[PDB]
Amino acid sequence: GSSGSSGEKEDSKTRGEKIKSDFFELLSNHHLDSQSRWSKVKDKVESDPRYKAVDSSSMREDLFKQYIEKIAKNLDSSGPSSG
Known part of the structure; x- marks a missing residue:
């Protein structure tokens, strides 16, 4: 993405975070x-x-x-993910 922002703010003016x-x-x-x-x-x-x-x-x-883009491409598989 392009829009950048530190941490996460839960204000009324903009509640996109939760929406995302x-x-x-x-x-x-x-x-x-x-x-x-x-x-x-x-x-x-x-x-x-x-x-x-x-x-x-x-x-x-x-x-x-x-999201879809990530799936199609090599999925992030690392750790105990595999059993």
């Missing part, structure tokens, strides 16, 4: 797959009120794309 966390949670919960399609994830997440929280579209495509 919720977004990821949902997507991930939908067992995202490399062949993930925004149109699909959207038609599936739409049913959820959390998806309504995000007003800015850019955040949706960007965020969603970000």
Whole structure:
């Protein structure tokens, strides 16, 4: 991303932080797959009120794309992750 910021502030003026966390949670919960399609994830997440929280579209495509991008590419596997 481009927008930078230290730590995390939970103010009323801007409560995007929490909104961001919720977004990821949902997507991930939908067992995202490399062949993930925004149109699909959207038609599936739409049913959820959390998806309504995000007003800015850019955040949706960007965020969603970000997560998916990581999946497709070599997944971060390290530690006891493997059993």
